[PDB]
Amino acid sequence: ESQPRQNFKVETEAGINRQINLELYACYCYQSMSFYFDRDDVALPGFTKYFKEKSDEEREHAEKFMKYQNKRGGRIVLQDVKKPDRDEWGTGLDAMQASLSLEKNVNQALLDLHTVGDKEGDKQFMDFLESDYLEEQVEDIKKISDHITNLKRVGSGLGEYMFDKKSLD
Amino acid sequence: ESQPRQNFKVETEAGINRQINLELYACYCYQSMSFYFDRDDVALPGFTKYFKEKSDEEREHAEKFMKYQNKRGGRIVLQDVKKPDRDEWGTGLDAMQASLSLEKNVNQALLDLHTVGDKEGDKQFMDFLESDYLEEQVEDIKKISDHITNLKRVGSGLGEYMFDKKSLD
Amino acid sequence: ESQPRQNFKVETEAGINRQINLELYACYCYQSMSFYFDRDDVALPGFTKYFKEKSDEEREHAEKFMKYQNKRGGRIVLQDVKKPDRDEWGTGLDAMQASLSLEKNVNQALLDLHTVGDKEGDKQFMDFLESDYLEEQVEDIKKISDHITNLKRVGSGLGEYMFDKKSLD
Amino acid sequence: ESQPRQNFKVETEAGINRQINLELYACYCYQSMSFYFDRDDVALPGFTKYFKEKSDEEREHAEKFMKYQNKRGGRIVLQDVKKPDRDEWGTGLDAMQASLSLEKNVNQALLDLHTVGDKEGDKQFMDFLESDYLEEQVEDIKKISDHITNLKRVGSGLGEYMFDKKSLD
Ligand SMILES: [Fe+3]
Ligand SMILES: [Fe+3]
Ligand SMILES: [Fe+3]
Ligand SMILES: [Fe+3]
Ligand SMILES: [Fe+3]
Ligand SMILES: [Fe+3]
Ligand SMILES: [Fe+3]
Ligand SMILES: [Fe+3]
């Protein structure tokens, strides 16, 4: 039993290892999205920058879980991170819709991880998830939904072009 | 009779209490408008900010009347402020049209209040209304009418999107 | 079902709409208190400023709930905000005592809303209430209780006058 | 007929000469009040400074009427300014009460002067009175009434001493 370990169950420890893989997978997806909009036949630089920043955020999510795992005395066990499920992401609207579905899947996985901590009485782990992950997911899911509405509002062509300029930095 | 009271008729005092309620009602309407454009399925942040500022202006209108009531020796009597007459405000054009109708109703109520002061010989109250309310209403009604014209000019979709960016801060 | 909606129950959504009305009602009460101490026959400017700041805080409470409602995918439904239950608030001590009773009623309503979120498994909503509302209520209820003790200590007349100068900014 | 004279009736011109005398009389009263509280057997330096500032304000009122008289083409005719009706002004409360009665007498005289301008169709003179005199009188009468309430609240002795320190600069 590691020196720091206290009120930290193996099932909680295993759940954190699974979430690390998912955050790394989300990071991979956004990286793929970013460079897809960097293609010469797509060429939307706001979308490119937007998904690069989102990719880096997900990397921070994974590493903060790695750091937390060590803090509690758990042991990180890494797995293959799968390639994303598409090679091309359609229009800006399509990519944004994919991004919402991704964020909602990470959110449910986080809520499932909270439940493991709750049933195990991991009072600290629950507040860690609440403060550092659950709040951010809710903000991100709202922002992305707004983006979806506006990409539908502006339409294709010039509309998508201007959204790239005015809604993304 | 309160210490400051001089040339201040009960009918003028009652009129100010009625106007306080209306300014508070306008404030409530704009608050509702602001957060309606903050819905994920509306998501126009310029409209949201625009109506939040207008809501706060109306709150200032109500409180300045409360302050004036005390200055003259009157007594503030508050009433229920009704919920606004809609829960959803349509398009940006629809909301702007509603906002013009609201401002013109407050304006007529102010002009009716001026008439109470005029017939009662309340020379100071008349100039207070003129300087601090009538001028602002005329400016606001012109600004809103311009906004209506431009929302008709740009049309729905991308047009409404760009008005949100270029005409509202 | 709105785009962001996830782990957000209609009963939680309805509870937030009820709390919005209560925060708006508290805001109305403090506004009434503020201008009551601005009467020429009351004329305590520290109490006036103190309750104006408290009124604005309650307005922020209501609007942050409106913002949160939209974040989760709920729909804001506004209701009449009732006039406060008094037109005059007595002495500084009386007003402070009323203010404590008000804050404790909002607190219980918040704790009742936490229970709705808890039973529904709304992990994020619970931490939102904890971080942004429950902590502030506990601070405010302590501050007000201290004020009550000191208004009893100083007594009426000069004592109430000096409390207005030394305990309120 | 003087070069500037236009829409300026002799009755309006005579009314301004009467008001000049009254403003000068108010200035004299406040001067007497100021130095009364400077007596070694009164010795309240906040009251002394407070009435000195009020005296200087009244002097400005008289001179602005003198300036306005010349602007319209009227001719200033000065009269004896009577000594104030008391030589000693009692307590701080007594002096404040006298000061309220004085300000309300000047106010009624101003409202009577507005009526002369109104019946004569002196549109400019009416707004001059409104902007530069009527607003200030209403502010001053409210401030003084507040002071009366607080001098009653604190009582004699230490209370009057502390009002001199905390309510007057
Ligand atoms: Fe993440
Ligand atoms: Fe994310
Ligand atoms: Fe208004
Ligand atoms: Fe307005
Ligand atoms: Fe609150
Ligand atoms: Fe509060
Ligand atoms: Fe004067
Ligand atoms: Fe004066």
Side-chain angles (χ1 to χ4, degrees):
Chain A
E1 183 130 323
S2 51
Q3 309 183 96
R5 213 192 177 108
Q6 186 172 38
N7 200 37
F8 191 57
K9 266 39 171 175
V10 287
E11 210 195 314
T12 313
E13 174 180 2
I16 285 150
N17 279 327
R18 293 190 307 263
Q19 191 64 23
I20 286 161
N21 188 262
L22 188 58
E23 307 284 354
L24 291 173
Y25 172 78
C27 166
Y28 209 11
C29 284
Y30 280 128
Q31 197 170 52
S32 173
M33 282 190 226
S34 184
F35 281 94
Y36 166 81
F37 287 96
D38 180 64
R39 288 166 54 154
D40 77 87
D41 59 347
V42 181
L44 290 161
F47 279 88
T48 300
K49 164 151 130 191
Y50 170 74
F51 290 128
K52 168 67 170 134
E53 299 175 4
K54 292 203 60 115
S55 181
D56 288 349
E57 275 168 11
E58 295 301 335
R59 183 168 166 81
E60 271 144 63
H61 295 174
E63 293 196 354
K64 183 190 295 169
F65 269 127
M66 294 171 192
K67 189 85 163 166
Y68 187 81
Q69 183 79 281
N70 282 342
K71 265 170 196 179
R72 298 300 301 273
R75 290 295 169 253
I76 297 153
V77 175
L78 300 176
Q79 302 297 337
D80 291 357
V81 15
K82 301 303 199 163
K83 83 172 264 169
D85 46 22
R86 311 178 63 188
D87 294 320
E88 318 184 308
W89 302 92
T91 62
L93 179 57
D94 293 339
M96 213 49 84
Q97 294 265 29
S99 159
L100 177 61
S101 153
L102 174 62
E103 294 291 345
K104 292 186 92 177
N105 289 333
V106 176
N107 199 34
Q108 187 63 243
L110 291 169
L111 291 171
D112 288 353
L113 186 55
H114 195 282
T115 292
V116 176
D118 193 9
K119 78 173 216 215
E120 289 314 326
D122 205 328
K123 311 308 183 55
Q124 206 278 313
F125 180 53
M126 272 190 291
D127 193 70
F128 168 65
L129 286 178
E130 282 156 22
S131 308
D132 292 35
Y133 288 94
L134 290 193
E135 214 206 340
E136 168 49 26
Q137 276 317 105
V138 155
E139 302 281 346
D140 217 10
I141 286 161
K142 175 56 155 72
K143 288 189 208 162
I144 300 168
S145 303
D146 291 3
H147 285 338
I148 309 271
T149 299
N150 274 285
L151 280 159
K152 285 181 183 181
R153 166 179 289 117
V154 299
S156 64
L158 178 52
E160 173 183 64
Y161 177 90
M162 299 296 321
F163 176 97
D164 176 270
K165 311 292 165 309
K166 312 301 285 184
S167 287
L168 315 173
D169 293 348
Chain B
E1 183 130 323
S2 51
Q3 309 183 96
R5 213 192 177 108
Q6 186 172 38
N7 200 37
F8 191 57
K9 266 39 171 175
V10 287
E11 210 195 314
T12 313
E13 174 180 2
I16 285 150
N17 279 327
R18 293 190 307 263
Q19 191 64 23
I20 286 161
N21 188 262
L22 188 58
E23 307 284 354
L24 291 173
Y25 172 78
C27 166
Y28 209 11
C29 284
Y30 280 128
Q31 197 170 52
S32 173
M33 282 190 226
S34 184
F35 281 94
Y36 166 81
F37 287 96
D38 180 64
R39 288 166 54 154
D40 77 87
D41 59 347
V42 181
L44 290 161
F47 279 88
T48 300
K49 164 151 130 191
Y50 170 74
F51 290 128
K52 168 67 170 134
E53 299 175 4
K54 292 203 60 115
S55 181
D56 288 349
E57 275 168 11
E58 295 301 335
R59 183 168 166 81
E60 271 144 63
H61 295 174
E63 293 196 354
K64 183 190 295 169
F65 269 127
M66 294 171 192
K67 189 85 163 166
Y68 187 81
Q69 183 79 281
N70 282 342
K71 265 170 196 179
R72 298 300 301 273
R75 290 295 169 253
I76 297 153
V77 175
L78 300 176
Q79 302 297 337
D80 291 357
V81 15
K82 301 303 199 163
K83 83 172 264 169
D85 46 22
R86 311 178 63 188
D87 294 320
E88 318 184 308
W89 302 92
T91 62
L93 179 57
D94 293 339
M96 213 49 84
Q97 294 265 29
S99 159
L100 177 61
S101 153
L102 174 62
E103 294 291 345
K104 292 186 92 177
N105 289 333
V106 176
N107 199 34
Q108 187 63 243
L110 291 169
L111 291 171
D112 288 353
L113 186 55
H114 195 282
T115 292
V116 176
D118 193 9
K119 78 173 216 215
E120 289 314 326
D122 205 328
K123 311 308 183 55
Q124 206 278 313
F125 180 53
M126 272 190 291
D127 193 70
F128 168 65
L129 286 178
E130 282 156 22
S131 308
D132 292 35
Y133 288 94
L134 290 193
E135 214 206 340
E136 168 49 26
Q137 276 317 105
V138 155
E139 302 281 346
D140 217 10
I141 286 161
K142 175 56 155 72
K143 288 189 208 162
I144 300 168
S145 303
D146 291 3
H147 285 338
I148 309 271
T149 299
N150 274 285
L151 280 159
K152 285 181 183 181
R153 166 179 289 117
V154 299
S156 64
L158 178 52
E160 173 183 64
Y161 177 90
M162 299 296 321
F163 176 97
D164 176 270
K165 311 292 165 309
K166 312 301 285 184
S167 287
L168 315 173
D169 293 348
Chain C
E1 183 130 323
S2 51
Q3 309 183 96
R5 213 192 177 108
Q6 186 172 38
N7 200 37
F8 191 57
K9 266 39 171 175
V10 287
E11 210 195 314
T12 313
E13 174 180 2
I16 285 150
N17 279 327
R18 293 190 307 263
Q19 191 64 23
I20 286 161
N21 188 262
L22 188 58
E23 307 284 354
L24 291 173
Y25 172 78
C27 166
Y28 209 11
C29 284
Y30 280 128
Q31 197 170 52
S32 173
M33 282 190 226
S34 184
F35 281 94
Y36 166 81
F37 287 96
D38 180 64
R39 288 166 54 154
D40 77 87
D41 59 347
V42 181
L44 290 161
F47 279 88
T48 300
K49 164 151 130 191
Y50 170 74
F51 290 128
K52 168 67 170 134
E53 299 175 4
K54 292 203 60 115
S55 181
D56 288 349
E57 275 168 11
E58 295 301 335
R59 183 168 166 81
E60 271 144 63
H61 295 174
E63 293 196 354
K64 183 190 295 169
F65 269 127
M66 294 171 192
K67 189 85 163 166
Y68 187 81
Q69 183 79 281
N70 282 342
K71 265 170 196 179
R72 298 300 301 273
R75 290 295 169 253
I76 297 153
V77 175
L78 300 176
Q79 302 297 337
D80 291 357
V81 15
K82 301 303 199 163
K83 83 172 264 169
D85 46 22
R86 311 178 63 188
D87 294 320
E88 318 184 308
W89 302 92
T91 62
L93 179 57
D94 293 339
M96 213 49 84
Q97 294 265 29
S99 159
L100 177 61
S101 153
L102 174 62
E103 294 291 345
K104 292 186 92 177
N105 289 333
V106 176
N107 199 34
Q108 187 63 243
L110 291 169
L111 291 171
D112 288 353
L113 186 55
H114 195 282
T115 292
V116 176
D118 193 9
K119 78 173 216 215
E120 289 314 326
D122 205 328
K123 311 308 183 55
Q124 206 278 313
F125 180 53
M126 272 190 291
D127 193 70
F128 168 65
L129 286 178
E130 282 156 22
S131 308
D132 292 35
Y133 288 94
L134 290 193
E135 214 206 340
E136 168 49 26
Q137 276 317 105
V138 155
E139 302 281 346
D140 217 10
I141 286 161
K142 175 56 155 72
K143 288 189 208 162
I144 300 168
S145 303
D146 291 3
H147 285 338
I148 309 271
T149 299
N150 274 285
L151 280 159
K152 285 181 183 181
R153 166 179 289 117
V154 299
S156 64
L158 178 52
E160 173 183 64
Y161 177 90
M162 299 296 321
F163 176 97
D164 176 270
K165 311 292 165 309
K166 312 301 285 184
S167 287
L168 315 173
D169 293 348
Chain D
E1 183 130 323
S2 51
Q3 309 183 96
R5 213 192 177 108
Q6 186 172 38
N7 200 37
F8 191 57
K9 266 39 171 175
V10 287
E11 210 195 314
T12 313
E13 174 180 2
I16 285 150
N17 279 327
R18 293 190 307 263
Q19 191 64 23
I20 286 161
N21 188 262
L22 188 58
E23 307 284 354
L24 291 173
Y25 172 78
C27 166
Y28 209 11
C29 284
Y30 280 128
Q31 197 170 52
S32 173
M33 282 190 226
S34 184
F35 281 94
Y36 166 81
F37 287 96
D38 180 64
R39 288 166 54 154
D40 77 87
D41 59 347
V42 181
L44 290 161
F47 279 88
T48 300
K49 164 151 130 191
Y50 170 74
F51 290 128
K52 168 67 170 134
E53 299 175 4
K54 292 203 60 115
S55 181
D56 288 349
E57 275 168 11
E58 295 301 335
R59 183 168 166 81
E60 271 144 63
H61 295 174
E63 293 196 354
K64 183 190 295 169
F65 269 127
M66 294 171 192
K67 189 85 163 166
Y68 187 81
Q69 183 79 281
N70 282 342
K71 265 170 196 179
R72 298 300 301 273
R75 290 295 169 253
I76 297 153
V77 175
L78 300 176
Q79 302 297 337
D80 291 357
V81 15
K82 301 303 199 163
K83 83 172 264 169
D85 46 22
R86 311 178 63 188
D87 294 320
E88 318 184 308
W89 302 92
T91 62
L93 179 57
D94 293 339
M96 213 49 84
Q97 294 265 29
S99 159
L100 177 61
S101 153
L102 174 62
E103 294 291 345
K104 292 186 92 177
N105 289 333
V106 176
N107 199 34
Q108 187 63 243
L110 291 169
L111 291 171
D112 288 353
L113 186 55
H114 195 282
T115 292
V116 176
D118 193 9
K119 78 173 216 215
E120 289 314 326
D122 205 328
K123 311 308 183 55
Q124 206 278 313
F125 180 53
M126 272 190 291
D127 193 70
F128 168 65
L129 286 178
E130 282 156 22
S131 308
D132 292 35
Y133 288 94
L134 290 193
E135 214 206 340
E136 168 49 26
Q137 276 317 105
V138 155
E139 302 281 346
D140 217 10
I141 286 161
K142 175 56 155 72
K143 288 189 208 162
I144 300 168
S145 303
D146 291 3
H147 285 338
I148 309 271
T149 299
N150 274 285
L151 280 159
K152 285 181 183 181
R153 166 179 289 117
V154 299
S156 64
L158 178 52
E160 173 183 64
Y161 177 90
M162 299 296 321
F163 176 97
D164 176 270
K165 311 292 165 309
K166 312 301 285 184
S167 287
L168 315 173
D169 293 348

